[PDB]
Amino acid sequence: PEAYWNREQEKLNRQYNPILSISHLNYCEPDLRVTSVVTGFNNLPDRFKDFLLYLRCRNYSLLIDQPDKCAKKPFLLLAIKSLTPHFARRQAIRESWGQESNAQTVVRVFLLGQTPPEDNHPDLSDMLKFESEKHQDILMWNYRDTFFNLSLKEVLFLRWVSTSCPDTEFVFKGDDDVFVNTHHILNYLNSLSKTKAKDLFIGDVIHNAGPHRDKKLKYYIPEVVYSGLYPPYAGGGGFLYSGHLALRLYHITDQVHLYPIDDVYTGMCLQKLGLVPEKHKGFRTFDIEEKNKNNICSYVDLMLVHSRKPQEMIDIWSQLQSAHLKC
Ligand SMILES: *[C@@H]1O[C@H](CO)[C@@H](O[C@@H]2O[C@H](CO)[C@@H](O[C@@H]3O[C@H](CO[C@H]4O[C@H](CO)[C@@H](O)[C@H](O)[C@@H]4O)[C@@H](O)[C@H](O[C@H]4O[C@H](CO)[C@@H](O)[C@H](O)[C@@H]4O)[C@@H]3O)[C@H](O)[C@H]2NC(C)=O)[C@H](O)[C@H]1NC(C)=O
Ligand SMILES: CC(=O)N[C@@H]1[C@@H](O)[C@H](O[C@@H]2O[C@H](CO)[C@H](O)[C@H](O[C@@H]3O[C@H](CO)[C@@H](O)[C@H](O)[C@H]3NC(C)=O)[C@H]2O)[C@@H](CO)O[C@H]1O
Ligand SMILES: O=c1ccn([C@@H]2O[C@H](COP(=O)(O)OP(=O)(O)O)[C@@H](O)[C@H]2O)c(=O)[nH]1
Ligand SMILES: *[C@@H]1O[C@H](CO)[C@@H](O)[C@H](O)[C@H]1NC(C)=O
Ligand SMILES: [Cl-]
Ligand SMILES: [Cl-]
Ligand SMILES: [Mg+2]
């Protein structure tokens, strides 16, 4: 078409689809041709200019790995998107719904990029090494951890699954400011037939959405960048899928250009597999009703709630342990 991403994506489609008859994965120099191709490139916000220049570079390497995380074969892998300074959020997740267990082994990793000093981030590196050496649940890549780079966090994670955790039955991928009912999730996982557990992918799916064009909102996308409607995509606050689908998802990522909104990007990859994400009412990416926020019995049949502060996650998980004695 005329939107840049839509244009470069069709070029990918013809590369991978014979019926339609520089690298797009390993080119890590600034693609300067975008400056004369995208209308009004110099008047775009810096995140767009960085996203367009390095759209074709995704070969980033792990700086902090936990290679023996899935030694014991996990039933559920919890992968949590996080930023370096979120020490309290990560620690509260460890102490509540993200703790490792066996009961069906559950493993936990936090996904991080770099918060480099050249972006005026405070040097928290030696506190992150301290945190890593003590909890051994930090995965960190050497890319600039930013909002528009989150679909990069998705691809680099799916790569780590295929190379360091391909056996895991299921994967939960979510944010570090949500409460997840890990107990209710595992009971849902064992109330599933092998037929459905094959290509399982559930979340707060959004249908027939389009790019926000409000120049001042977070998910704003210019019309020179993307045109049309998003595919169905689960809310990035947290979705649940099987390891089998994770491997299929990773191998299809090369056929989809990175997109600045990472949960939309996952939907584009699901669409390319011929799959539709499955809505589930337990995923409350928009919280619940304030009158029900007091009641611990309101959290028993939920899958996740967004959003929650660290001490809120701990308070709910604490109360949730005695919920079967009073609900
Ligand atoms: C997602 O994450 C990736 C990975 O971290 C980010 O990619 C990096 O993006 C930064 C820009 O923010 C890149 O750094 C920039 O490189 C430009 C080109 O420099 C190369 O080429 C010149 C010749 O043209 C060589 O001299 C040089 O050795 C480099 O090899 C620079 O022009 C940029 O200049 C910036 O800093 C200097 C010094 O302060 C000043 O001139 C400017 O003020 C300017 O700010 C800058 O250095 C970096 O190369 C990318 N890394 C990789 C591995 O690709 C993405 O930006 C990020 N995406 C989003 C959307 O966040
Ligand atoms: C029919 C329709 O138009 N529905 C709209 C929703 O699509 C829209 O949802 C929000 O959209 C954003 C992109 O436009 C984005 O997907 C957002 O999810 C968040 O996305 C970030 C990355 O962009 C991801 O990292 C994060 O995990 C995720 N957060 C949560 C809690 O899921 C999504 O909410 C909505 C705008 O609020 O409006 C609907 O009308
Ligand atoms: O540069 C970033 C910004 C966000 N996040 C994570 O991505 C999730 C979504 O962040 P945010 O809550 O700000 O987006 P929202 O939920 O409001 O859409 C959160 O868990 C953040 O920790 C990240 O990993 N890197
Ligand atoms: C990606 O690969 C290219 C070519 O092999 C290389 O020049 C570049 O440095 C790589 N990027 C990273 C981050 O290693
Ligand atoms: Cl621990
Ligand atoms: Cl907070
Ligand atoms: Mg959030």
Author numbering: 55 to 75, 90 to 171, 174 to 397
Pull verbatim passages from the article behind this deposition:
β1,3-N-acetylglucosaminyltransferases (B3GNTs) are Golgi-resident glycosyltransferases involved in the biosynthesis of poly-N-acetyl-lactosamine chains. They catalyze the addition of the N-acetylglucosamine to the N-acetyl-lactosamine repeat as a key step of the chain elongation process. Among the characterized B3GNTs, B3GNT2 is the major poly-N-acetyl-lactosamine synthase, and deletion of its coding gene dramatically reduced the cell surface poly-N-acetyl-lactosamine and led to hypersensitive and hyperresponsive immunocytes. The luminal domain of B3GNT2 comprises an N-terminal helical domain (Pro55–Cys125) and a C-terminal catalytic domain (Cys138–Cys397) as well as an extended linker (Arg126–Lys137) that connects the helical domain to the catalytic domain.
To obtain a ternary complex structure, we soaked B3GNT2 crystals with both donor and acceptor substrates as well as magnesium ion at the same time. Interestingly, electron density was clearly observed for both products UDP and trisaccharide GlcNAcβ1-3Galβ1-4GlcNAc but no remaining density for the residual substrates UDP-GlcNAc or LacNAc, indicating that the glycosyltransferase reaction took place during soaking and the products were not yet released. As a result, we were able to obtain the crystal structure of B3GNT2 with both products bound (B3GNT2_tri_UDP). Structural comparison of the product-bound and the substrate-bound B3GNT2 reveals a clear picture of the inverting glycosyltransferase reaction. Consequently, the C-P bond breaks in UDP-GlcNAc and the new β-1,3-glysosidic bond forms between GlcNAc and Gal, accompanied by GlcNAc converting from α anomer to β anomer. The GlcNAc ring therefore rotates by 30°, losing interactions with Tyr289 but establishing new hydrogen bond with the backbone nitrogen of Gly306 through its N-acetyl group. The pyrophosphate of UDP is also able to rotate slightly to release the torsion and be further stabilized by Tyr289 and Lys288. Notably, all the other residues coordinating the two products are the same residues recognizing the two substrates and they undergo minimal conformational changes during the reaction.
